[PDB]
Write a protein that binds this DNA or RNA. Structure first.
Ligand code: FES
Lengths: 112, 156, 154, 195, 21, 142, 27, 80
RNA sequence: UUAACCAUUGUAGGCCUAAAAGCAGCCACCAAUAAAGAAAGCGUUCAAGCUCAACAUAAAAUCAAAAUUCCAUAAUUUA
């Protein structure tokens, strides 16, 4: 579900990724939103790569990493999968997500 | 609250929802002062915010609400953050006659101080002492109670 | 130097925090009222006391010059166009013979102040401007309608 | 309403205009102002917030601007500083040293502060040092605000206690003048918000 | 609503949860 | 549209001060002078008169005139045709009580110029103020 | 170079210790 | 607008909105602008009736309608 | 202090101004009215004329946190 990640603030439009091919006129700067449109999984991979130690073992670790844009997973991977990890951030509930009982419990602060 | 029915038209004054009795702090000048909610609400607290917003997401007049200006700015900013985060599905802008959404994907955002439309990209990030700062949160909410050891990092 | 900068930061002034902000304060007392405006009280007091029955009619967008002409016109009717700023009119009842005539003097309206029950002259003033609406006449300083004014006037 | 203020008692001297300043005649500016710190004749003046060097052009800018705009009927102007005497080698020009908190120009007469705020601020911006237009009421408020912040300071540790007690051997890294400044003056600049 | 009542919100309650020995 | 002018009755066609100014809105200049000439015959010739002509959009004339200016009469009463440069303190003539009052009594006859006040205090102030405007001091007695 | 939060606190603690030294030298 | 009729009862409970709306209609500048209008005020809940030559009749009661709503509605109609 | 509304009459007041009427210069600096500045910015062949102040009707309340290729990655709350 990397396609559905959320960025705090205006990181979507403010974060720029810069890469250089090494040849003349090889400088490329792409905004986070543009990068996500080109590839939903690229942003997640880039962040992990930077966080990883700057050593030779980093490339090997990247191979063991599996990134899927959507919920689809190969069956064999599921069999390999042992445990799932809780989501780091608790997702705020939307108006519809709020239960009817919760609405009743919440008081009306002011009367229009 | 008056609603007009429509040439011959008739306006009917209808019953308005009443505030719950016995505020925790009676005699407060503003409802937030009355309810001891000065520093305990956030943009995620949609339930409180929705009461002060128009059906289509517009801001209600301050005079009708009666709350002090300080809360007015805080509440408006919190509501602005919720709209940009898509937390108000039932208060979305009204499409005038027959318009339809562009149907392009909407990026998931939260803690957005400014509109993404008018923010330019930052090409030059800078070095250690020249690093550019990315705003997170709003200055209006600095006074809110903090449960962390050190003050929150407004600029990321 | 960096070390000297450390000293400055520690010595930085610390401001105290008020318990409650001025807007969110509990209800505080207020100073006693003062009558500034006091002159206008005498003028309105004299005219109303002199004239028992007052015909209250809303003022159309009339011109200042016409009011003087109408003032002379009422002199033929034995009535006076004496008017003053209405923001001091409301406190009139607070300090005057009566306290209960506030609802009659609502908004900006022409006041016809007459001390004598010359009904025909008052009716003639009504005939001068039909479009201008006559709210009513407080005959003998008693609240009454325009239709009632005529009925009692009869 | 209440009675309107009057300036009848004020008397305008005959020499309403400002006099001419000559083109031509070491810590003069690195310290607190010791002279011209009190209003003498007028109720409005310009207060130096920093240490700067006033050349002949600045005096003409003050003289020409003030004379053209001021009203002799209701205003008068006086000079609170001497003419330039410090040479600036290329000598290109001479300057008048000024200390932090020195009143450079004082204007009075039958006028309000708001009338002179715009012109004084414009002159202050054109001055070589940071400056703020001041008046008798405003200057006292600044001191009153200065006193209030000092009196209500909640910091357990103060600059004077540490400096006077030589805690951490701080005096080894501090200049003798710093004791008098007490953190309110740094170099040729004065920190108004340092309490 | 009783005196000293605060509706539960993100900032009303501490992140940590009280326990009873 | 109200246009105020002080032109003398003696000359009914001053030219620029009336002709084209009234003409700019669009009117018949000849018609204006003829009615003004009618006023001239009724009134003494060669004395300034305030006028309150209203130029309506219908290209019609609504000519209203009143008493001759007391200001010029004060100048004439003081024997002054062209006053001093300033006239704030310059004075060439002094007017006593009796002369001041006599003209005021006749003055209170025009529906215009607000000459309907029962008290004469209002009337004297305008002429007293007018004298202040002119190079004339109104001394009680000389 | 802005001062770190830890640095400010550390100096304050040392200053207090020196203050205690002053009192015991006052008798 | 050939005719505009404003009716309200001052002796009884009188709404400020309708009374204020009457003042705006009964203005030297407003009346001149809509010269065709014949201004008639009925003085004795309040009912305001405006009659047009085309047959469009707009009736406004100020009991629960503010003067702005009437002015906003009337202004569009006058332009036609 | 600063948010709505309105602007009547003396008098084009005297000054070399052809003429300058609040508003080219120049004056001193009053009146009526409920409210009119002998005028505050505009307009100006000159004036008519645009508003601000007038009166009525609104509602408020001491500064911060240049030319090869961007350059750790990131991150607002469990004491
Ligand atoms: S909480 Fe009391 S005024 Fe805002």
């Amino acid at each position: 579900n990397t396609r559905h990640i959320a960025f705090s603030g205006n990181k979507w439009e403010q974060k720029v990724y810069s890469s250089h091919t090494g040849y003349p006129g090889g400088f490329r700067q792409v905004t986070a939103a543009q990068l996500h449109r080109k590839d939903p999984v690229a942003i997640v991979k880039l962040a992990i790569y930077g966080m990883l130690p700057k050593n030779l073992h980093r490339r090997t670790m990247m191979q063991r990493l599996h990134l899927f844009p959507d919920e689809d997973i190969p069956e064999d991977i599921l069999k390999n999968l042992v445990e799932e990890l809780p989501q780091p951030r608790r997702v705020p509930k939307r108006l519809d997500e709020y239960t009817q009982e919760e609405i009743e419990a919440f008081p009306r602060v002011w009367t229009p | 609250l008056r609603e007009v029915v429509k040439t011959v038209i008739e306006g009917r004054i209808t019953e308005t929802p009443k505030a719950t009795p016995d505020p925790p702090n009676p005699s407060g000048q503003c409802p937030i002062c009355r309810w001891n909610l000065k520093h305990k609400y956030t943009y995620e607290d949609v339930l409180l915010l929705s009461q002060f917003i128009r059906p289509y997401g517009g801001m209600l007049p301050r005079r009708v609400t009666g709350l002090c200006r300080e809360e007015h700015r805080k509440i408006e900013e919190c509501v602005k953050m919720a709209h940009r985060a898509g937390l108000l599905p039932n208060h979305r802008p009204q499409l005038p006659e027959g318009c339809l959404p562009k149907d392009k994907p909407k990026l998931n955002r939260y803690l957005t101080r400014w509109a993404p439309k008018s923010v330019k990209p930052i090409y030059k990030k800078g070095h250690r002492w020249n690093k550019v700062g990315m705003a997170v949160g709003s200055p209006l909410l600095k006074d809110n109670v903090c449960y962390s050891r050190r003050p929150l990092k407004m600029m990321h | 130097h960096f070390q000297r900068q450390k000293l400055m930061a520690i010595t930085e002034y610390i401001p105290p925090k008020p318990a409650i902000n001025p807007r969110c304060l509990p209800p505080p007392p207020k100073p006693p009222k003062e009558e500034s405006v006091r002159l206008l009280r005498q003028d309105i007091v004299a005219v109303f006391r002199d004239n028992r029955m007052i015909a209250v009619c809303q003022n159309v967008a009339l011109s200042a010059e016409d009011k003087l002409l109408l003032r002379h016109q009422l002199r033929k009717h034995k009535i006076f166009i004496k008017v003053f700023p209405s923001q001091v009119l409301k406190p009139f009842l607070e300090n005057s013979k009566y306290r209960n005539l506030l609802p009659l003097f609502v908004g900006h309206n022409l006041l016809l102040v007459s001390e004598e029950p010359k009904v025909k002259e008052m009716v003639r003033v009504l005939k001068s401007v039909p479009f201008l609406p006559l709210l009513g006449g407080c005959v003998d300083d008693t609240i009454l309608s325009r239709q009632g004014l005529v009925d009692y006037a009869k | 309403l209440l009675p309107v203020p009057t300036f009848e008692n004020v008397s305008i001297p005959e020499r309403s205009k400002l006099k001419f300043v000559e083109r031509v005649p070491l810590k003069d500016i690195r310290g607190p102002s010791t002279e011209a710190t009190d209003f003498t004749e007028g109720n409005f003046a310009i207060l130096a917030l920093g240490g700067g060097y006033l050349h002949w052009g600045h005096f003409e800018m003050m003289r020409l601007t003030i004379n053209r705009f001021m009203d002799p009927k209701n205003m008068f102007a006086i000079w609170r500083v001497p003419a330039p005497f410090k040479p600036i080698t290329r000598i290109d020009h001479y300057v008048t040293p000024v200390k932090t908190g020195c009143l450079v120009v004082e204007m009075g007469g039958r006028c309000e502060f708001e009338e002179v705020k715009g012109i004084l601020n414009q002159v202050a911006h054109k001055l070589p040092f940071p400056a703020k237009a001041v008046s008798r009421k405003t200057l006292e408020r600044m001191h009153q605000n200065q006193r209030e912040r000092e009196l209500n300071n909640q910091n357990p540790w103060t600059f004077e206690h540490i400096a006077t007690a030589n805690m951490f051997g701080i005096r080894k890294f501090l200049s003798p003048y710093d004791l008098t400044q007490k953190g309110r003056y740094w170099g040729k600049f004065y920190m108004p918000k340092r309490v | 609503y009783p005196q000293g009542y605060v509706p539960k919100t993100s900032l009303s309650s501490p992140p940590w949860q009280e326990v009873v020995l | 549209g109200v246009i105020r002018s002080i032109v003398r009755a003696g000359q009914a066609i001053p030219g620029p001060p009336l002709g084209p100014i009234l003409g700019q809105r669009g009117v018949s200049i000849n018609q204006f002078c003829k009615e003004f000439n009618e006023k001239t015959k009724d009134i003494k010739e060669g004395i300034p008169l305030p006028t309150k002509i209203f130029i309506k959009p219908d290209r019609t004339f609504e000519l209203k005139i009143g008493q001759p200016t007391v200001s010029y009469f004060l100048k004439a009463a003081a024997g002054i045709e062209k006053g001093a440069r300033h006239t704030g303190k310059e004075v060439a003539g002094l007017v006593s009580l009796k002369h001041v009052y006599e003209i005021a009594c006749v003055k209170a006859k025009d529906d215009a110029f607000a000459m309907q006040d029962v008290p004469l205090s209002s009337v004297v102030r305008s002429i007293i103020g007018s004298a202040r405007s002119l190079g004339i001091r109104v001394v009680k007695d000389l | 170079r802005t001062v770190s939060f830890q640095a400010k606190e550390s100096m304050i603690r040392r200053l207090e210790v020196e203050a205690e030294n002053h009192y015991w030298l006052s008798m | 607008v050939k005719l505009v009729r404003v009716q309200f009862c001052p002796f009884e409970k009188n709404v400020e909105s309708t009374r204020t709306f009457l003042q705006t209609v009964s203005s030297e500048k407003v009346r001149a602008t809509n010269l065709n209008c014949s201004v008639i005020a009925d003085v004795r809940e309040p009912c305001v009736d405006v009659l047009f030559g085309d047959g469009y009749r707009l009736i406004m009661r100020g009991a629960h309608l503010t003067t702005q709503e009437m002015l906003s509605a009337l202004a569009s109609h006058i332009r036609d």
